[PDB]
Amino acid sequence: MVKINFPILDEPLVLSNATILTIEDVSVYSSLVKHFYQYDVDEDDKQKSLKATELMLVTDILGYDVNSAPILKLIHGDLENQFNEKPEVKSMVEKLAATITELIAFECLENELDLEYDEITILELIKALGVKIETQSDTIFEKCFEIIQVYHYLTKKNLLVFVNSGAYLTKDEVIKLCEYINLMQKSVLFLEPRRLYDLPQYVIDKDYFLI
Amino acid sequence: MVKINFPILDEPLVLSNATILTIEDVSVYSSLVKHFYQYDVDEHLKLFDDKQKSLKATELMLVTDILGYDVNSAPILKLIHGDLENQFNEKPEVKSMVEKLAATITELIAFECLENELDLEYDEITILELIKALGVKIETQSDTIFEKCFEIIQVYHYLTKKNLLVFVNSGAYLTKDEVIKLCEYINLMQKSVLFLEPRRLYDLPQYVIDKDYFLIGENMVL
Amino acid sequence: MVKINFPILDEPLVLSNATILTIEDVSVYSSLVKHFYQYDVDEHLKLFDDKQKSLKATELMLVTDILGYDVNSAPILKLIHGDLENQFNEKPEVKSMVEKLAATITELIAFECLENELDLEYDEITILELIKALGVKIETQSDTIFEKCFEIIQVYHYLTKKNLLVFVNSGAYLTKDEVIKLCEYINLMQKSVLFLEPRRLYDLPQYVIDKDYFLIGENMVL
Amino acid sequence: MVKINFPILDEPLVLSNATILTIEDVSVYSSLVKHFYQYDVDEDDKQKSLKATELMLVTDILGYDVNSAPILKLIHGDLENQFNEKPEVKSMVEKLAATITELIAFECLENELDLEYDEITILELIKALGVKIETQSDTIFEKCFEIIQVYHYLTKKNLLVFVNSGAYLTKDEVIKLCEYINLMQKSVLFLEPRRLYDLPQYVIDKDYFLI
Ligand SMILES: [Ca+2]
Ligand SMILES: [Ca+2]
Ligand SMILES: [Ca+2]
Ligand SMILES: [Ca+2]
Ligand SMILES: [Ca+2]
Ligand SMILES: [Ca+2]
Ligand SMILES: [Ca+2]
Ligand SMILES: [Ca+2]
Ligand SMILES: [Ca+2]
Ligand SMILES: [Ca+2]
């Protein structure tokens, strides 16, 4: 359930599900952002520190790559699972693939070479279709949603941090993100330089006090 | 037919179907093998006909390591998959059938994409992608060196750009009955194959350049 | 100078040297940031001048993740190393000197190659290879977000193909004195830089589009 | 010091330094060649079997790649060592590199960018020179020699096997190879289908007897 601590903070802060952390001091805010990008060099999970690779750090939302080969692999596997949950439709795809197979098989036999082959699987069909996340038309909200949905897939990630993203989002959008995150039950941090609407959030004051 | 010439030969030698050329002198044998591997920078080594026209270096297929020869290399697979696509292109009715089936599959996967919580897009499933997904490749059930040779000859017949296959020093791996079977198989596929040997290959019909550099026509009809 | 226009503006806005543009409405701010990232497919978003001529998409340099910005990317390094080679090409005396030294080194390594028991060959040591071997790269001693910004502006000045740099939502990382220092540094390098902000950046001279979409000239001379 | 055993062989045969193994039966010869290429699937060093990666197997001599990145690395390192053994000449190279460095340094300072750099090392000079084994003009003997010389570098290889190479080599050439191998003290096997001149060699007869 991951907790955060630094010199300014007297007691470690619990980051469960969706958390907004607002730091009103510019120099402390900029410093913490810097330290996130440098994690870990300077200074629940039973006292266990998170590996650098467990961190998912986002400032440039639109530029963030949600279509990496590891992510595509998980999406295609998830889609294969959807077919597995529908035996009716899975059989349809298989029947279609078997017809295709025999058409290619006939051409293989006509070819002068002694040719062999394996099979066309549902997963191979999904991959060949080039299924990917649409990002071209993304609003910043839409891309934030896609990033969180990807974080849901990544088991080796246990903290997603949006740096200074609040400025792009309406109150209703922040709520919608948070509600999805709460349902997901993985830790997300919105690290903000000023109050994000009137939403529940941890505020470190200009006098370094926690609210 | 392909013709071979080099200084030691008095005249060019015709290489039609399966030919065995035996060189009994180690130095001359070794030099000829070297010149084949250098073709055509050497010459000395001449390969022609194409009526009087030299074979391009690209037309030569040299095999010394029989088991190491990769019948399903990336370039060979690319050729096979492209040729199979062309076979569909030449058959409009069946091409249309494959395309129809791929589109029905696409519509089914598209539905699952919309059901999925992510905003998903995709391209298309092509005939080439289907051929590739099926894992089409040349059958390779050969265990022995003898068996492997047939697969190599099959590749040679497939490659229209090749006009001479040379097995270098392969006789040592093969029984007499095996060489006969290979030569019979070679005869069926029409293209020139040379077995280049350092010693006489049993008592089979063969050209022999002996220790005094005479060309002898061994078990050959007078 | 570069000019920016979009429907909410009554007339184009001149972006000369350092400019702060503040948009107090979340939706309009978010939409403008999106349109910058989509430039030029959107438009709506207009960027021109080049006297009346639209900036090409390639002329825009957008920075939101300051610390993530890679100042020594492979493309940037390739440009730097090529430019340094060109600097030698423009100086025949020094080019000749480098070539002479490389040839003396070559003759020394060549001797060791002949002493070595392997039959060794080689090509040549080029000026470009020497530049690359030396590990020439932009100095990056920045620790803070503020310090990193100077390195980004330096890259922007270097890239002649870029004609607008936009820092998106960067004001939140910087003190007032820091923004002033950045703007003073930007002024020295002549090219247009836009700080695109969702809230007023201290009391610095800035253009503000307020909640009712009025354009206000904040701490600006009347 | 590696030993060889198979069904036909009643006792394991010691393969020390250069060894010629002649098998007069065509079917046994072809079979053993096949098994070498399949090692290990079918059936000194204290009873320890060699890994497949310890094997260096050569039939197509001229086609064999002696200029792989791992080999080039070792050659360039060996050449750097030759300079290290000659402090006089090493200093000459360094002095020349330092002059080059300052010429580039001046251009770096003239350039509008604030540029830094490291150093030009002897090893980097050798690599930039593109030092490699010449193979284009190779006779088969010359390439055999190069292959053995490369085997000398490869510490993770402990048996080099030339399959049916004798046919290409004169007696004096086989001697020259063997003498280098004996000096090297790594195991090399010449696997031959008939006697290789009158040189000392292990012969398995047409009646399967060892001489
Ligand atoms: Ca067939
Ligand atoms: Ca398959
Ligand atoms: Ca596709
Ligand atoms: Ca989208
Ligand atoms: Ca969907
Ligand atoms: Ca040498
Ligand atoms: Ca400089
Ligand atoms: Ca260096
Ligand atoms: Ca070079
Ligand atoms: Ca050589």
PDB file of N, CA, C and O in Angstrom, chain A residues 78-79 82-83 86 96 99-100 104 106-107 111-120 124 128-134 149 153 180, chain B residues 80 84 87-88 91 101 104-106 109 112 116-125 129-130 133-139 154 157-158:
ATOM      1  N   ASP A  78      -5.032 -10.037 -22.834  1.00  0.00           N
ATOM      2  CA  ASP A  78      -6.317  -9.712 -22.205  1.00  0.00           C
ATOM      3  C   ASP A  78      -7.471  -9.964 -23.185  1.00  0.00           C
ATOM      4  O   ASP A  78      -8.496 -10.537 -22.814  1.00  0.00           O
ATOM      5  N   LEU A  79      -7.286  -9.538 -24.433  1.00  0.00           N
ATOM      6  CA  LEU A  79      -8.266  -9.752 -25.502  1.00  0.00           C
ATOM      7  C   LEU A  79      -8.480 -11.232 -25.837  1.00  0.00           C
ATOM      8  O   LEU A  79      -9.610 -11.657 -26.086  1.00  0.00           O
ATOM      9  N   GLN A  82     -10.753 -12.603 -23.224  1.00  0.00           N
ATOM     10  CA  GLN A  82     -12.149 -12.250 -23.510  1.00  0.00           C
ATOM     11  C   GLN A  82     -12.811 -13.272 -24.444  1.00  0.00           C
ATOM     12  O   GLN A  82     -13.976 -13.636 -24.251  1.00  0.00           O
ATOM     13  N   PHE A  83     -12.064 -13.730 -25.447  1.00  0.00           N
ATOM     14  CA  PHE A  83     -12.528 -14.819 -26.305  1.00  0.00           C
ATOM     15  C   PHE A  83     -12.681 -16.130 -25.523  1.00  0.00           C
ATOM     16  O   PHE A  83     -13.671 -16.849 -25.700  1.00  0.00           O
ATOM     17  N   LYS A  86     -15.837 -16.470 -23.758  1.00  0.00           N
ATOM     18  CA  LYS A  86     -16.979 -16.636 -24.658  1.00  0.00           C
ATOM     19  C   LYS A  86     -16.733 -17.827 -25.605  1.00  0.00           C
ATOM     20  O   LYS A  86     -16.310 -17.620 -26.744  1.00  0.00           O
ATOM     21  N   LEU A  96     -13.172 -20.017 -38.577  1.00  0.00           N
ATOM     22  CA  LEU A  96     -12.707 -19.122 -39.640  1.00  0.00           C
ATOM     23  C   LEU A  96     -11.218 -19.300 -39.924  1.00  0.00           C
ATOM     24  O   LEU A  96     -10.789 -19.324 -41.091  1.00  0.00           O
ATOM     25  N   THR A  99     -10.525 -22.540 -41.902  1.00  0.00           N
ATOM     26  CA  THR A  99     -10.821 -22.393 -43.323  1.00  0.00           C
ATOM     27  C   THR A  99      -9.659 -21.679 -44.025  1.00  0.00           C
ATOM     28  O   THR A  99      -9.136 -22.184 -45.017  1.00  0.00           O
ATOM     29  N   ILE A 100      -9.241 -20.527 -43.493  1.00  0.00           N
ATOM     30  CA  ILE A 100      -8.034 -19.831 -43.971  1.00  0.00           C
ATOM     31  C   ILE A 100      -6.835 -20.776 -44.081  1.00  0.00           C
ATOM     32  O   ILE A 100      -6.138 -20.811 -45.110  1.00  0.00           O
ATOM     33  N   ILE A 104      -4.491 -21.781 -47.413  1.00  0.00           N
ATOM     34  CA  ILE A 104      -3.030 -21.653 -47.472  1.00  0.00           C
ATOM     35  C   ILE A 104      -2.386 -23.037 -47.656  1.00  0.00           C
ATOM     36  O   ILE A 104      -1.438 -23.183 -48.422  1.00  0.00           O
ATOM     37  N   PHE A 106      -3.566 -25.637 -49.234  1.00  0.00           N
ATOM     38  CA  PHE A 106      -3.677 -26.018 -50.649  1.00  0.00           C
ATOM     39  C   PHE A 106      -2.569 -25.375 -51.484  1.00  0.00           C
ATOM     40  O   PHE A 106      -1.944 -26.042 -52.315  1.00  0.00           O
ATOM     41  N   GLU A 107      -2.335 -24.081 -51.266  1.00  0.00           N
ATOM     42  CA  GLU A 107      -1.249 -23.380 -51.958  1.00  0.00           C
ATOM     43  C   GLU A 107       0.131 -23.937 -51.582  1.00  0.00           C
ATOM     44  O   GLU A 107       1.019 -24.025 -52.432  1.00  0.00           O
ATOM     45  N   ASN A 111       2.737 -25.537 -54.312  1.00  0.00           N
ATOM     46  CA  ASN A 111       4.119 -25.056 -54.387  1.00  0.00           C
ATOM     47  C   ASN A 111       5.101 -26.222 -54.541  1.00  0.00           C
ATOM     48  O   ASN A 111       4.905 -27.284 -53.947  1.00  0.00           O
ATOM     49  N   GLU A 112       6.150 -26.031 -55.334  1.00  0.00           N
ATOM     50  CA  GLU A 112       7.090 -27.119 -55.632  1.00  0.00           C
ATOM     51  C   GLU A 112       7.830 -27.648 -54.390  1.00  0.00           C
ATOM     52  O   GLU A 112       8.251 -28.807 -54.364  1.00  0.00           O
ATOM     53  N   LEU A 113       7.976 -26.797 -53.374  1.00  0.00           N
ATOM     54  CA  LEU A 113       8.675 -27.165 -52.140  1.00  0.00           C
ATOM     55  C   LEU A 113       7.810 -28.044 -51.257  1.00  0.00           C
ATOM     56  O   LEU A 113       6.599 -27.867 -51.211  1.00  0.00           O
ATOM     57  N   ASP A 114       8.434 -28.983 -50.555  1.00  0.00           N
ATOM     58  CA  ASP A 114       7.752 -29.756 -49.529  1.00  0.00           C
ATOM     59  C   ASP A 114       7.628 -28.874 -48.295  1.00  0.00           C
ATOM     60  O   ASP A 114       8.595 -28.678 -47.556  1.00  0.00           O
ATOM     61  N   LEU A 115       6.434 -28.329 -48.092  1.00  0.00           N
ATOM     62  CA  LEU A 115       6.209 -27.341 -47.038  1.00  0.00           C
ATOM     63  C   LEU A 115       5.415 -27.906 -45.867  1.00  0.00           C
ATOM     64  O   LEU A 115       4.504 -28.714 -46.054  1.00  0.00           O
ATOM     65  N   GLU A 116       5.783 -27.478 -44.663  1.00  0.00           N
ATOM     66  CA  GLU A 116       5.035 -27.786 -43.453  1.00  0.00           C
ATOM     67  C   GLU A 116       4.632 -26.470 -42.781  1.00  0.00           C
ATOM     68  O   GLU A 116       5.073 -25.398 -43.190  1.00  0.00           O
ATOM     69  N   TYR A 117       3.787 -26.557 -41.760  1.00  0.00           N
ATOM     70  CA  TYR A 117       3.312 -25.369 -41.055  1.00  0.00           C
ATOM     71  C   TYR A 117       2.794 -25.754 -39.672  1.00  0.00           C
ATOM     72  O   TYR A 117       2.704 -26.944 -39.350  1.00  0.00           O
ATOM     73  N   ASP A 118       2.469 -24.758 -38.850  1.00  0.00           N
ATOM     74  CA  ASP A 118       1.923 -25.049 -37.523  1.00  0.00           C
ATOM     75  C   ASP A 118       0.415 -24.752 -37.448  1.00  0.00           C
ATOM     76  O   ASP A 118      -0.388 -25.568 -37.911  1.00  0.00           O
ATOM     77  N   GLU A 119       0.035 -23.589 -36.925  1.00  0.00           N
ATOM     78  CA  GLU A 119      -1.377 -23.194 -36.832  1.00  0.00           C
ATOM     79  C   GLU A 119      -1.515 -21.675 -36.705  1.00  0.00           C
ATOM     80  O   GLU A 119      -0.576 -20.999 -36.280  1.00  0.00           O
ATOM     81  N   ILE A 120      -2.683 -21.149 -37.069  1.00  0.00           N
ATOM     82  CA  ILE A 120      -3.003 -19.742 -36.835  1.00  0.00           C
ATOM     83  C   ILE A 120      -3.868 -19.646 -35.578  1.00  0.00           C
ATOM     84  O   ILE A 120      -5.000 -20.140 -35.551  1.00  0.00           O
ATOM     85  N   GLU A 124      -2.327 -14.815 -32.371  1.00  0.00           N
ATOM     86  CA  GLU A 124      -1.634 -14.389 -33.588  1.00  0.00           C
ATOM     87  C   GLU A 124      -2.516 -13.511 -34.471  1.00  0.00           C
ATOM     88  O   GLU A 124      -2.017 -12.608 -35.139  1.00  0.00           O
ATOM     89  N   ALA A 128      -1.571  -9.709 -35.450  1.00  0.00           N
ATOM     90  CA  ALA A 128      -1.571  -9.348 -36.864  1.00  0.00           C
ATOM     91  C   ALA A 128      -2.514  -8.186 -37.138  1.00  0.00           C
ATOM     92  O   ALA A 128      -2.245  -7.369 -38.005  1.00  0.00           O
ATOM     93  N   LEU A 129      -3.615  -8.112 -36.395  1.00  0.00           N
ATOM     94  CA  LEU A 129      -4.562  -7.004 -36.541  1.00  0.00           C
ATOM     95  C   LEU A 129      -3.966  -5.665 -36.085  1.00  0.00           C
ATOM     96  O   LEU A 129      -4.469  -4.604 -36.451  1.00  0.00           O
ATOM     97  N   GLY A 130      -2.894  -5.722 -35.299  1.00  0.00           N
ATOM     98  CA  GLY A 130      -2.184  -4.510 -34.868  1.00  0.00           C
ATOM     99  C   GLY A 130      -2.978  -3.705 -33.851  1.00  0.00           C
ATOM    100  O   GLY A 130      -2.964  -2.465 -33.871  1.00  0.00           O
ATOM    101  N   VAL A 131      -3.674  -4.413 -32.962  1.00  0.00           N
ATOM    102  CA  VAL A 131      -4.465  -3.772 -31.908  1.00  0.00           C
ATOM    103  C   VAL A 131      -3.548  -2.951 -31.009  1.00  0.00           C
ATOM    104  O   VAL A 131      -2.508  -3.435 -30.558  1.00  0.00           O
ATOM    105  N   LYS A 132      -3.934  -1.702 -30.775  1.00  0.00           N
ATOM    106  CA  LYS A 132      -3.155  -0.784 -29.959  1.00  0.00           C
ATOM    107  C   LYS A 132      -4.080   0.259 -29.358  1.00  0.00           C
ATOM    108  O   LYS A 132      -5.230   0.389 -29.776  1.00  0.00           O
ATOM    109  N   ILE A 133      -3.570   1.002 -28.382  1.00  0.00           N
ATOM    110  CA  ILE A 133      -4.293   2.132 -27.808  1.00  0.00           C
ATOM    111  C   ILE A 133      -4.300   3.299 -28.799  1.00  0.00           C
ATOM    112  O   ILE A 133      -3.254   3.669 -29.349  1.00  0.00           O
ATOM    113  N   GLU A 134      -5.484   3.851 -29.049  1.00  0.00           N
ATOM    114  CA  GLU A 134      -5.608   5.065 -29.852  1.00  0.00           C
ATOM    115  C   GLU A 134      -5.156   6.222 -28.976  1.00  0.00           C
ATOM    116  O   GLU A 134      -5.658   6.381 -27.859  1.00  0.00           O
ATOM    117  N   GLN A 149      -5.075   3.052 -16.894  1.00  0.00           N
ATOM    118  CA  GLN A 149      -5.535   1.733 -17.349  1.00  0.00           C
ATOM    119  C   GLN A 149      -4.357   0.802 -17.667  1.00  0.00           C
ATOM    120  O   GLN A 149      -4.429  -0.405 -17.432  1.00  0.00           O
ATOM    121  N   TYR A 153      -2.431  -2.874 -15.779  1.00  0.00           N
ATOM    122  CA  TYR A 153      -1.789  -4.061 -16.353  1.00  0.00           C
ATOM    123  C   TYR A 153      -0.417  -4.365 -15.752  1.00  0.00           C
ATOM    124  O   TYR A 153      -0.052  -5.527 -15.594  1.00  0.00           O
ATOM    125  N   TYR A 180     -12.004   5.455 -10.609  1.00  0.00           N
ATOM    126  CA  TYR A 180     -11.422   4.311 -11.311  1.00  0.00           C
ATOM    127  C   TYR A 180     -10.241   3.749 -10.524  1.00  0.00           C
ATOM    128  O   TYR A 180     -10.099   2.531 -10.399  1.00  0.00           O
TER     129      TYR A 180
ATOM    130  N   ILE B  80       9.584 -17.649 -49.901  1.00  0.00           N
ATOM    131  CA  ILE B  80       8.475 -18.610 -49.864  1.00  0.00           C
ATOM    132  C   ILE B  80       7.145 -17.925 -49.547  1.00  0.00           C
ATOM    133  O   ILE B  80       6.143 -18.148 -50.231  1.00  0.00           O
ATOM    134  N   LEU B  84       3.888 -17.569 -52.054  1.00  0.00           N
ATOM    135  CA  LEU B  84       2.551 -18.047 -51.682  1.00  0.00           C
ATOM    136  C   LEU B  84       1.502 -16.943 -51.772  1.00  0.00           C
ATOM    137  O   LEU B  84       0.377 -17.196 -52.214  1.00  0.00           O
ATOM    138  N   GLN B  87       0.683 -16.591 -55.376  1.00  0.00           N
ATOM    139  CA  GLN B  87      -0.199 -17.696 -55.781  1.00  0.00           C
ATOM    140  C   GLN B  87      -1.678 -17.354 -55.533  1.00  0.00           C
ATOM    141  O   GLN B  87      -2.542 -17.696 -56.345  1.00  0.00           O
ATOM    142  N   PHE B  88      -1.959 -16.673 -54.420  1.00  0.00           N
ATOM    143  CA  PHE B  88      -3.301 -16.129 -54.176  1.00  0.00           C
ATOM    144  C   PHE B  88      -3.642 -15.012 -55.163  1.00  0.00           C
ATOM    145  O   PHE B  88      -4.762 -14.961 -55.680  1.00  0.00           O
ATOM    146  N   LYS B  91      -5.025 -16.211 -58.226  1.00  0.00           N
ATOM    147  CA  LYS B  91      -6.301 -16.909 -58.068  1.00  0.00           C
ATOM    148  C   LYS B  91      -7.340 -16.003 -57.376  1.00  0.00           C
ATOM    149  O   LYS B  91      -7.560 -16.125 -56.166  1.00  0.00           O
ATOM    150  N   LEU B 101     -12.822 -14.078 -45.057  1.00  0.00           N
ATOM    151  CA  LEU B 101     -12.641 -14.757 -43.774  1.00  0.00           C
ATOM    152  C   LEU B 101     -11.864 -13.892 -42.782  1.00  0.00           C
ATOM    153  O   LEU B 101     -12.211 -13.826 -41.600  1.00  0.00           O
ATOM    154  N   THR B 104     -14.200 -11.203 -41.483  1.00  0.00           N
ATOM    155  CA  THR B 104     -15.126 -11.719 -40.473  1.00  0.00           C
ATOM    156  C   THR B 104     -14.411 -11.853 -39.125  1.00  0.00           C
ATOM    157  O   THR B 104     -14.933 -11.408 -38.102  1.00  0.00           O
ATOM    158  N   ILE B 105     -13.208 -12.427 -39.135  1.00  0.00           N
ATOM    159  CA  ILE B 105     -12.364 -12.474 -37.932  1.00  0.00           C
ATOM    160  C   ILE B 105     -12.133 -11.060 -37.366  1.00  0.00           C
ATOM    161  O   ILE B 105     -12.297 -10.837 -36.163  1.00  0.00           O
ATOM    162  N   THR B 106     -11.772 -10.119 -38.238  1.00  0.00           N
ATOM    163  CA  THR B 106     -11.552  -8.720 -37.842  1.00  0.00           C
ATOM    164  C   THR B 106     -12.768  -8.134 -37.115  1.00  0.00           C
ATOM    165  O   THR B 106     -12.625  -7.544 -36.040  1.00  0.00           O
ATOM    166  N   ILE B 109     -12.880  -9.636 -33.554  1.00  0.00           N
ATOM    167  CA  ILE B 109     -11.867  -8.997 -32.695  1.00  0.00           C
ATOM    168  C   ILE B 109     -12.205  -7.523 -32.419  1.00  0.00           C
ATOM    169  O   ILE B 109     -11.992  -7.036 -31.305  1.00  0.00           O
ATOM    170  N   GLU B 112     -14.578  -7.262 -29.522  1.00  0.00           N
ATOM    171  CA  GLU B 112     -13.872  -7.434 -28.250  1.00  0.00           C
ATOM    172  C   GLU B 112     -13.066  -6.195 -27.860  1.00  0.00           C
ATOM    173  O   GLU B 112     -12.957  -5.878 -26.673  1.00  0.00           O
ATOM    174  N   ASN B 116     -13.586  -4.139 -24.482  1.00  0.00           N
ATOM    175  CA  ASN B 116     -12.432  -3.775 -23.654  1.00  0.00           C
ATOM    176  C   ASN B 116     -12.509  -2.325 -23.175  1.00  0.00           C
ATOM    177  O   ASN B 116     -12.942  -1.446 -23.924  1.00  0.00           O
ATOM    178  N   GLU B 117     -12.085  -2.080 -21.937  1.00  0.00           N
ATOM    179  CA  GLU B 117     -12.185  -0.744 -21.339  1.00  0.00           C
ATOM    180  C   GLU B 117     -11.229   0.291 -21.945  1.00  0.00           C
ATOM    181  O   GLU B 117     -11.475   1.497 -21.843  1.00  0.00           O
ATOM    182  N   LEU B 118     -10.144  -0.174 -22.562  1.00  0.00           N
ATOM    183  CA  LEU B 118      -9.211   0.730 -23.244  1.00  0.00           C
ATOM    184  C   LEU B 118      -9.785   1.215 -24.562  1.00  0.00           C
ATOM    185  O   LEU B 118     -10.547   0.500 -25.212  1.00  0.00           O
ATOM    186  N   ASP B 119      -9.416   2.430 -24.950  1.00  0.00           N
ATOM    187  CA  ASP B 119      -9.768   2.955 -26.256  1.00  0.00           C
ATOM    188  C   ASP B 119      -8.800   2.388 -27.288  1.00  0.00           C
ATOM    189  O   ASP B 119      -7.656   2.838 -27.412  1.00  0.00           O
ATOM    190  N   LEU B 120      -9.271   1.385 -28.020  1.00  0.00           N
ATOM    191  CA  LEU B 120      -8.409   0.604 -28.887  1.00  0.00           C
ATOM    192  C   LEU B 120      -8.662   0.862 -30.362  1.00  0.00           C
ATOM    193  O   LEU B 120      -9.799   1.085 -30.786  1.00  0.00           O
ATOM    194  N   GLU B 121      -7.576   0.843 -31.125  1.00  0.00           N
ATOM    195  CA  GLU B 121      -7.624   0.912 -32.574  1.00  0.00           C
ATOM    196  C   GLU B 121      -6.774  -0.224 -33.142  1.00  0.00           C
ATOM    197  O   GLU B 121      -6.105  -0.944 -32.390  1.00  0.00           O
ATOM    198  N   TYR B 122      -6.808  -0.387 -34.461  1.00  0.00           N
ATOM    199  CA  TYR B 122      -6.103  -1.483 -35.127  1.00  0.00           C
ATOM    200  C   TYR B 122      -5.906  -1.164 -36.606  1.00  0.00           C
ATOM    201  O   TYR B 122      -6.427  -0.158 -37.103  1.00  0.00           O
ATOM    202  N   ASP B 123      -5.143  -2.005 -37.305  1.00  0.00           N
ATOM    203  CA  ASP B 123      -4.989  -1.837 -38.752  1.00  0.00           C
ATOM    204  C   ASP B 123      -5.798  -2.879 -39.543  1.00  0.00           C
ATOM    205  O   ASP B 123      -7.015  -2.733 -39.660  1.00  0.00           O
ATOM    206  N   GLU B 124      -5.145  -3.920 -40.061  1.00  0.00           N
ATOM    207  CA  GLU B 124      -5.834  -4.976 -40.820  1.00  0.00           C
ATOM    208  C   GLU B 124      -5.052  -6.278 -40.762  1.00  0.00           C
ATOM    209  O   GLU B 124      -3.847  -6.272 -40.499  1.00  0.00           O
ATOM    210  N   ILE B 125      -5.731  -7.388 -41.026  1.00  0.00           N
ATOM    211  CA  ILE B 125      -5.068  -8.686 -41.154  1.00  0.00           C
ATOM    212  C   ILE B 125      -4.851  -8.980 -42.640  1.00  0.00           C
ATOM    213  O   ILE B 125      -5.812  -9.148 -43.394  1.00  0.00           O
ATOM    214  N   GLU B 129       0.392 -11.713 -43.609  1.00  0.00           N
ATOM    215  CA  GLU B 129       0.431 -11.921 -42.160  1.00  0.00           C
ATOM    216  C   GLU B 129      -0.125 -13.287 -41.760  1.00  0.00           C
ATOM    217  O   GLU B 129       0.386 -13.926 -40.837  1.00  0.00           O
ATOM    218  N   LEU B 130      -1.161 -13.736 -42.466  1.00  0.00           N
ATOM    219  CA  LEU B 130      -1.748 -15.047 -42.215  1.00  0.00           C
ATOM    220  C   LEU B 130      -0.794 -16.181 -42.592  1.00  0.00           C
ATOM    221  O   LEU B 130      -0.633 -17.144 -41.839  1.00  0.00           O
ATOM    222  N   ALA B 133       1.832 -16.118 -39.931  1.00  0.00           N
ATOM    223  CA  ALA B 133       1.305 -16.650 -38.669  1.00  0.00           C
ATOM    224  C   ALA B 133       1.199 -18.180 -38.705  1.00  0.00           C
ATOM    225  O   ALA B 133       1.419 -18.846 -37.689  1.00  0.00           O
ATOM    226  N   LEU B 134       0.885 -18.731 -39.876  1.00  0.00           N
ATOM    227  CA  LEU B 134       0.756 -20.190 -40.028  1.00  0.00           C
ATOM    228  C   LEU B 134       2.099 -20.928 -39.902  1.00  0.00           C
ATOM    229  O   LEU B 134       2.131 -22.142 -39.696  1.00  0.00           O
ATOM    230  N   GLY B 135       3.200 -20.190 -40.019  1.00  0.00           N
ATOM    231  CA  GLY B 135       4.535 -20.743 -39.799  1.00  0.00           C
ATOM    232  C   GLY B 135       5.005 -21.632 -40.932  1.00  0.00           C
ATOM    233  O   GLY B 135       5.685 -22.636 -40.698  1.00  0.00           O
ATOM    234  N   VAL B 136       4.634 -21.266 -42.159  1.00  0.00           N
ATOM    235  CA  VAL B 136       5.010 -22.023 -43.356  1.00  0.00           C
ATOM    236  C   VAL B 136       6.533 -22.054 -43.508  1.00  0.00           C
ATOM    237  O   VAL B 136       7.197 -21.015 -43.452  1.00  0.00           O
ATOM    238  N   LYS B 137       7.070 -23.257 -43.689  1.00  0.00           N
ATOM    239  CA  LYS B 137       8.508 -23.456 -43.827  1.00  0.00           C
ATOM    240  C   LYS B 137       8.771 -24.781 -44.545  1.00  0.00           C
ATOM    241  O   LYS B 137       7.890 -25.646 -44.607  1.00  0.00           O
ATOM    242  N   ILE B 138       9.967 -24.929 -45.104  1.00  0.00           N
ATOM    243  CA  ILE B 138      10.345 -26.173 -45.774  1.00  0.00           C
ATOM    244  C   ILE B 138      10.435 -27.293 -44.736  1.00  0.00           C
ATOM    245  O   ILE B 138      10.966 -27.090 -43.641  1.00  0.00           O
ATOM    246  N   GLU B 139       9.884 -28.454 -45.083  1.00  0.00           N
ATOM    247  CA  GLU B 139       9.910 -29.637 -44.226  1.00  0.00           C
ATOM    248  C   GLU B 139      11.350 -30.121 -44.063  1.00  0.00           C
ATOM    249  O   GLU B 139      12.077 -30.252 -45.050  1.00  0.00           O
ATOM    250  N   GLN B 154      16.640 -29.540 -53.192  1.00  0.00           N
ATOM    251  CA  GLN B 154      15.302 -28.962 -53.322  1.00  0.00           C
ATOM    252  C   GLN B 154      15.350 -27.425 -53.284  1.00  0.00           C
ATOM    253  O   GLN B 154      14.696 -26.769 -54.093  1.00  0.00           O
ATOM    254  N   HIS B 157      16.821 -26.112 -56.615  1.00  0.00           N
ATOM    255  CA  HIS B 157      15.822 -26.087 -57.693  1.00  0.00           C
ATOM    256  C   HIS B 157      14.862 -24.907 -57.541  1.00  0.00           C
ATOM    257  O   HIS B 157      14.409 -24.329 -58.530  1.00  0.00           O
ATOM    258  N   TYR B 158      14.566 -24.552 -56.292  1.00  0.00           N
ATOM    259  CA  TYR B 158      13.637 -23.458 -55.999  1.00  0.00           C
ATOM    260  C   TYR B 158      14.212 -22.090 -56.364  1.00  0.00           C
ATOM    261  O   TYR B 158      13.486 -21.206 -56.817  1.00  0.00           O
TER     262      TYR B 158
END
